[PDB]
Each structure stands twice: as C-alpha cells, then as structure tokens.
Design a protein around this ligand. Structure first.
Ligand SMILES: [Ca+2]
Length: 129
C-alpha cells in the first residue's frame, strides 16, 4: 500500500504537491518524502499522472515537474541516469526555447522542456510498501 493521501498505481505511489518550487527543490522534497520526482516511463503511468494534474487544476500551461532532466545534452531519468525509451513530448517539444530548457514538466498535459528554476508544482513517486 501507500501512505494516506497518496494515489496508488500498481507498485507505485504518487502525490501532487501544489507548492511552487524549482526542479531541484521539488526533487529534494520528494526525496525527503521517501521518493523521487515522478518518472512516467510507461503510457499507463503517464495517464495516471495526467489525471492527477486534472484533479488538481494543473492541466494548463506550466504544469508540474517530472523527474527528467537534460544532462550533457541528452535527456535522462534522474533517479537512474537512464535514457528515455517511452516518450510523450508535446508537439514541437523539446524546443529548447531560450537555449536553457533542461528539465521536464507537464505543459498542457504533454511533456515539455522548461528552464529548471521556473517555479512549478510537482509530482512525487515512491515505492508501495
Ligand atoms: Ca519547451
């Protein structure tokens, strides 16, 4: 199971945090909560997280942080350092607007690259116990 108030999906537990934070601050928080920024690596995981965004009024622009980051020019999941396999980029993304969009978030319920110190809400994930 999951702690109270978290959303179970299979062997994962998710939670939406509304407080606005940089990617790094959001990560540290999720780590404090015993987990990581959410890493939707499957279609079904992404559906669950998008539904959480809708639930929390964050289905528009500047939606919540996810655990992907661009490191050395390539995108990776920050928990493992693994490259992406499954991708859910929105149209024309990642567009590197401004040349410094190095963190992953939801923008209109699709993946987008955004500057890492934009202050967005965030999704955490932890293993079910
Ligand atoms: Ca972008």
């Amino acid at each position: 199971g999951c702690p109270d108030g978290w959303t179970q999906f299979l062997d994962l537990c998710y939670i939406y945090q509304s407080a606005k934070a940089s990617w790094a601050s959001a990560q540290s928080s999720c780590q404090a909560l015993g987990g990581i920024l959410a890493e939707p690596d499957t279609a079904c995981e992404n559906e669950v997280l998008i539904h959480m965004c809708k639930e929390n009024g964050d289905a528009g622009s500047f939606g919540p942080w996810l655990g992907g980051q661009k490191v050395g020019g390539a995108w990776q999941w920050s928990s493992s350092g693994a490259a992406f396999d499954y991708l859910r980029w929105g149209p024309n993304e990642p567009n590197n607007s401004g040349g410094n969009e190095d963190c992953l978030h939801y923008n209109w319920l699709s993946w987008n690259d955004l500057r890492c110190h934009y202050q967005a809400s965030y999704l955490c994930q932890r293993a079910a116990e």
